[PDB]
């Protein structure tokens, strides 16, 4: 009596369950862990809130419509206003984390579709107008998804994002996003997607506002579809849990 379809994850005062998941993808094989003394530079005693910061934060849901192109969330950012994890970002110059990203989305034996849940590290995005760079307000959606576009975005001295889905706003083949830790929610067999991401970056720690080392993207390759009778509102919810969060350089708050 054991099925890999079932699973349960506990982190802090929060637990998640699935009865129809795939496996669980673990980063680049690496499992999150605090910073070793032989790999640090910040000389001050770090802070490890632990249970207070490394828990499951459930973001705003999103509707998957027969035509939705996709969504995305910058990671250090998507939680910058949730609980003490956010409070620690505001109060500290330096931060370091990994996350257990859990994307939920149930349908029924009668619906169909296939999402691609992926964690893209260092997802720098392009601009609609080749002479500028997207603005913060256009890139960051903090706890509320950012939508990809079904077709190109016009130029014209604006600071918009080239949200064309098949280009992942990075100017690359969207179908090659698999070289990144990922899973596929194929309503037919799947029902949720879990990915544990280890801290990634070219430095031991970084400022959590000024930089977004990972970007979560959900992108349907096979559009939702059902039949008259089957329910029409199929939401997609994202829950993310920080792991081994450390903060250095304490000072006055504010994300200025």
């Amino acid at each position: 009596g054991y099925s890999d379809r079932v699973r349960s994850i506990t982190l802090g005062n929060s637990t998640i369950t699935t009865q129809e998941c795939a496996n669980v993808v673990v980063g680049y094989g690496v499992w999150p862990d605090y910073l070793k003394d032989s790999e640090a530079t910040a000389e001050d005693q770090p802070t490890q809130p632990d249970v207070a910061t490394c828990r499951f934060y459930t973001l705003d849901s999103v509707q998957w419509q027969k035509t939705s192109p996709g969504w995305w969330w910058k990671l250090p950012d998507a939680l910058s206003n949730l609980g003490l994890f956010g409070q620690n970002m505001q109060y500290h110059y330096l931060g370091r984390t990994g996350y257990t990203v859990h994307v939920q989305c149930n349908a029924s034996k009668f619906h169909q579709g296939c999402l691609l849940v992926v964690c893209v590290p260092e997802a720098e995005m392009g601009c609609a107008t080749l002479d500028n760079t997207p603005s913060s307000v256009e890139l960051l959606g903090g706890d509320s998804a950012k939508e990809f576009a079904d077709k190109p975005v016009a130029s014209g001295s604006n600071k918009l994002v080239q949200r064309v889905v098949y280009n992942a706003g990075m100017g690359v083949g969207v179908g090659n996003l698999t070289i990144f830790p990922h899973q596929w929610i194929n309503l037919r067999t799947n029902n949720s997607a879990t990915i544990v991401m280890p801290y990634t970056n070219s430095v031991p720690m970084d400022n959590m506002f000024r930089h977004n080392n990972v970007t979560l993207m959900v992108i349907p390759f096979v559009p939702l579809d059902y039949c008259p009778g089957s329910t029409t509102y199929v939401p997609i919810t994202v829950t993310i849990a920080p792991m081994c969060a450390e903060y250095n350089g304490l000072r006055l708050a504010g994300h200025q």
């Binding site: 496996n23 893209v120 260092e122 690359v172 083949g173 070289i179 997607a193």
Partner: protein
Amino acid sequence: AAIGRVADTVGTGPTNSEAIPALTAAETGHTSQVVPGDTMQTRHVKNYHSRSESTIENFLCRSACVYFTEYENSGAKRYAEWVITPRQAAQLRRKLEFFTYVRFDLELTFVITSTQQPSTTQNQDAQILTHQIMYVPPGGPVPDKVDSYVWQTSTNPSVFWTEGNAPPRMSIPFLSIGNAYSNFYDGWSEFSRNGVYGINTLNNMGTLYARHVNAGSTGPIKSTIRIYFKPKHVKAWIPRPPRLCQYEKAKNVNFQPSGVTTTRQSITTMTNT
């Protein structure tokens, strides 16, 4: 096998069990590990093929012209200057961008060539040209004229070369301020999320300056300096999708939406049309 050899093909025969190598579930995010023998009778093959030419090192270790400008014997532009960057050339840049972070030493090679400019000067008799390339790390005094005191280079490193001799060359250590060069940076330079955005907020590799040391002839001469990069002792992390859309700007990833691939008639056409 042989350190870099490839897997040998394991001979297989008829099957009829409940073992399902062929059935899997891509949703997991796991790539199948199936091999010929799993879905068909195979013979045994001792494979000696090596993957030697696919090492990160062999892939990024070839000199690549990343940029080039010119400066003239006399006139307005008597000395050249270039803010160091690997993103103005598309060849090498697309390879390096195959990975998110990278670390390597660099073998620098310079190809310096001169060409006589058309003029009306009588009896021109050029002497051999001697150039001077000089590197100015961020924060150092810059030359404002071909005879500025700055070309003293008491401390700045610089090479002196003379036409005819082999291309000047020199090694450069991994100069990052961090634990690895960053190829992408989904962040800003300001904590307010203003100022600069993207890879260019990290680029602070200083500037390169070239000039002649002597004018040579009475006539006018123009010199071109080609800068080549060659990564050595490479270490790369987090591979990413190769660049699809052509490059647009040198200081950001801005692109012009492109199709996923070239087209063809129908999903049945065995031809590239």
